[PDB]
Amino acid sequence: MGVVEEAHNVKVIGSGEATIVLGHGFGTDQSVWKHLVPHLVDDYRVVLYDNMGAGTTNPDYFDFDRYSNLEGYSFDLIAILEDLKIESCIFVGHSVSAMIGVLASLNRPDLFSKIVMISASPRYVNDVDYQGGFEQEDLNQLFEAIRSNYKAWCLGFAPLAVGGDMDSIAVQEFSRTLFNMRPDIALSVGQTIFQSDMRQILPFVTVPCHILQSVKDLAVPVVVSEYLHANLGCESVVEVIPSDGHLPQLSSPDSVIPVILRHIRNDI
Ligand SMILES: O=C1C=C[C@H](Cc2ccc(-c3ccccc3)cc2[N+](=O)[O-])O1
């Protein structure tokens, strides 16, 4: 493939028009989809890619100005879609990737037939009329910990994000992918994500959105899902899952994958 496909570790599995693109969240890579993809390959052409700055990607390619906001990531996504001659896709977006997909669909709604979000949020920071999950002081202690001692921060953060049992295979995997990130890049992407505010553009979305989340998610209070549902400008549905964790498609696939598959496979 071309430089931008190689740079993002693009995998394409299968052929056909019916296509699904899967974007991962901060701290992991395309391997977060390992339990979902086996259920998709028989009906869809499956596109996987890593966000720039993931531990699987070349740090020389991490342009701190390009990725200073979410639009830098949406331009990457669009470029991959165009490079792959993809005319229309179902986009499954995990965590920040949910809003990267929303951004891309504002510029190219023709490219997306629907967006399935998992663990999405347009705004993490609380204000007097919006519960996001974090007070600004929460963030400060985060950037202070990451900056202080990254490795230690990875070990501590991974079980809280994955949730569930602390001895799990998923906590193992995530702490690894978290730690393979270059500490300055991890920091820079952290700021961009946590300082993001997608709330004001939601009304302009014109693609149907399925809003999925763990009922217990350290980074996404359940009211966020309802906020998204109430302010998105196209049709949308919410389904809160009886699961624990920010990466439930990895950590609790038995209860989580069937829900994701229902929302991929069926329309509103
Ligand atoms: O991107 C996001 C924002 C919130 C959720 C969960 C989350 C993911 C990633 C990170 C993070 C990773 C590496 C370095 C710094 C921060 C932190 C959180 N968090 O605080 O909750 O996803």
Residue numbers in the entry: 1 to 268
What does the report in the manuscript say about this coordinate set?
Karrikin Insensitive 2 (KAI2) proteins are plant α/β-hydrolases with dual receptor-enzyme function that perceive smoke-derived karrikins (KARs) and an endogenous, yet undiscovered, KAI2 ligand (KL). Upon ligand binding, KAI2 is activated and interacts with its target proteins, including MAX2 and SMAX1, which initiate the physiological responses. KAI2 and D14 are α/β-hydrolases containing a Ser-His-Asp catalytic triad in their hydrophobic substrate-binding pockets, and therefore both proteins display hydrolytic activity toward various SL analogs, including GR24, desmethyl-GR24, and debranones compounds. Activation of KAI2 is thought to require hydrolysis of the ligand; however, this has not been experimentally proven.
